[PDB]
Amino acid sequence: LLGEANSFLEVLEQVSHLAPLDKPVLIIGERGTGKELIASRLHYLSSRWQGPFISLNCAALNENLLDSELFHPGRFERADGGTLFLDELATAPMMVQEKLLRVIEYGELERVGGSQPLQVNVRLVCATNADLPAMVNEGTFRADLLDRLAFDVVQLPPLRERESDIMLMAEYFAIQMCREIKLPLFPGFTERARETLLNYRWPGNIRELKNVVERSVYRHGTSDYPLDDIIIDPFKR
Ligand SMILES: Nc1ncnc2c1ncn2[C@@H]1O[C@H](COP(=O)(O)OP(=O)(O)OP(=O)(O)O)[C@@H](O)[C@H]1O
Known part of the structure; x- marks a missing residue:
């Protein structure tokens, strides 16, 4: 990772303290700023480093397949014991965002009938460039999801x-x-x-x-x- 700017160095310092937690982290920054590289660092610097690092861009997939992709098996299942990076959150459907809140809040994947709900052990990281607090006020991002998901925020400076x-x-x-x-x-x-x-x-x-x-x-x-x-x-x- 290149850079000596004070603002970038404060990000790396922050990441070094956040990585060992199992708490969800939000990364804010413009395209191309290194949000995925930071998410990867959060994983490799954590206790979960030998565990998987699964990633997914909630725009690299049809809106209606997000659900089942997230929760065919899902990314959560794949990240169990490990870490999950979700880029492009501010364009997830509300229902996925409410379900996301539940997985965060309850630690398990909902299962309709037959199968009992699936317990997962997944460190979550999300990324975006929206003023998420602005999307909350716009009716486009859940106030309740943000109240829990943003345990802490890493702001990556633009170039x-x-x-x-x-x-x-x-x-x-x-x-x-x-x-x-x-x-x-x-x-x-x-x-x-x-x-x-x-x-x-x-x-x-x-x-x-x-x-x-x-x-x-x-x-x-x-x-x-x-x-x-x-x-x-x-x-x-
Ligand atoms: N500090 C850095 N040092 C060297 N290369 C970097 C640095 N940060 C980002 N890059 C490079 O820039 C490109 C984008 O980084 P990355 O995908 O992590 O950013 P991003 O914010 O996740 O982008 P996007 O959300 O648009 O996909 C990659 O080639 C990456 O290797």
């Missing part, structure tokens, strides 16, 4: 608020790309390059930075001169 890290990360990603394309040395970034990198708002944050930098190193294609042209938008040219 534009970790401005000291933009060049550190850009240089790392550029060097890795130089290795991929067999250039002998990364020749550096011009000041024009650095202005471009630092003045851009990075709506896709670290994912976007890596792709931008890699593309730019490739287009440049040489170690003879410093990299001047940062290609933010490949759809222009």
Whole structure:
């Protein structure tokens, strides 16, 4: 994990204290900010580290199949003894959100008839970029679920608020790309390059930075001169 920005370092410190708890954690941050990497850290730094790390994006699946996917068997079942990461929570159906509250509140998976309810031992982590308290007031997120799910909140800073890290990360990603394309040395970034990198708002944050930098190193294609042209938008040219 790259970064030295105070705001990022306070997140890592926080994660180190939260990881051993069995309490549910909410991660707030923009796309591409490393929320999944932090969730993975919460799992590997916990007592449950030898246990499974199951993950699921509540947008990587049809709305009507969330239920049965979550609770065919489900992610909870798979994460038993382990940890479950749920990205994109602010677009889960209310019923899944009320059922989610029940699994949190009661520690067991509801079973209709026949089978008795299934006891699970799962550390939960969720992630989003909504003002969840705003979705509660909007009738789009359950006030009761939030009152219990947000035991604590990890706020991951966007890249534009970790401005000291933009060049550190850009240089790392550029060097890795130089290795991929067999250039002998990364020749550096011009000041024009650095202005471009630092003045851009990075709506896709670290994912976007890596792709931008890699593309730019490739287009440049040489170690003879410093990299001047940062290609933010490949759809222009
Ligand atoms: N601190 C970091 N150091 C190096 N790479 C990072 C860092 N944080 C994120 N990245 C990289 O950026 C990309 C996105 O990270 P990740 O998927 O964890 O973020 P995310 O917030 O979960 O994104 P999204 O919700 O949009 O899927 C990945 O390539 C990841 O390796």
